[PDB]
A paper describes a structure:
[name] from [name] is a member of the [name] family, which have been implicated in regulation of the stress-response in bacteria. Functional studies have previously shown [name] as an essential regulator of virulence factors in [name]. Importantly, the over-expression of [name] negatively regulates the production of the two [name] exopolysaccharides, amylovoran and levan.
Two different crystal forms developed in the conditions used for crystallisation; rectangular crystals and rhombic plates, with the thicker rectangular crystals regularly producing better diffraction quality crystals. [name] forms a homodimer in the asymmetric unit with a solvent content of 60.12% (Vm = 3.08 Å3/Da). The protein contains 3 α-helices (residues 10–20; 67–82; 115–138) surrounding a 5 stranded antiparallel β-sheet (residues 34–35; 47–53; 56–64; 88–92; 100–106) with the concave surface facing the solvent and flanked by two protruding loops (residues 27–33; 93–99) to create a channel. Half of the dimer interface is characterized by hydrophobic interactions between the bent α-helix and β-strand of each chain, while the other half of the interaction face forms a hydrophilic pocket containing 18 highly ordered water molecules, and is capped by hydrogen bonding between the two N-terminal tails. The carboxy-terminal 17 amino acids of [name] form an unstructured chain, accounting for 10% of the protein sequence.
Numbering used by the authors:
A (entry chain B): 2 to 145
B (entry chain A): 0 to 144
Amino acid sequence: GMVSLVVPDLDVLRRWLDQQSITWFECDSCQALHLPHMQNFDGVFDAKIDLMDGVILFSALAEVKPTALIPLAGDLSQINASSLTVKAFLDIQDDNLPKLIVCQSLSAAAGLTYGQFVHFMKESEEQISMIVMEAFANHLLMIA
Amino acid sequence: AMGMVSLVVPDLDVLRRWLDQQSITWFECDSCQALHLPHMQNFDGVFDAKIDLMDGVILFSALAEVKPTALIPLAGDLSQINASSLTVKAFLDIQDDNLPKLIVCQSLSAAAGLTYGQFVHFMKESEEQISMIVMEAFANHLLMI
């Protein structure tokens, strides 16, 4: 049948997460909707929903072992090639543990439907969790 | 808030039609199911671009050939290239028989349905983001002719 096509803002996303019974919290310092259930996957210290220039991003963050940083940076092509949708890259700071970011995007500027968002939440959770769990099994990550 | 639509799950024929409606030329390899996109070869570096449909996901990918001397440096900048776009991915495909390739790509998840307008948005945003990545790598002398 027919469905509403909507250009969403963060309130739309929050309501759509409630409609899925997916729990979210906020950071006071940050603009994302954080997803506590993703910390049930080993290696995940945070996961979140951002909205940035009309694109939705679901990302998960893992802390990387300093000794695995170089082998991981050398695995990035194969990790990115392993998923049709998910992408993985490193975020390295001078003040902190290096981070693996594993993320999927959904472009929202031409409108989305609720069902498209639901599918996104499920496909992303699956594809993201797979990469991060694999990295955890390969002894690359710190326990959260 | 732009109204009611009816979504379609496209197959490859749907995508052919949708590319026809945007007057985007495509053609078919003897040896893939990808819809190749000649117009992408007008961006320096790009030796091939195509659309694939696989397991309910559309992929718009461009391929460029990387100079052997730029391979390690490019391997080192992948995180930054992937962090620089909200939607495009980039990775290396290296064979013993050929030159290394840089693969720059964007996906559109199709299995829950799409409107034609979403697909159009995808082609325009993919082209823009892919070309930006490939052009910058060309400018930085990482690619072959």
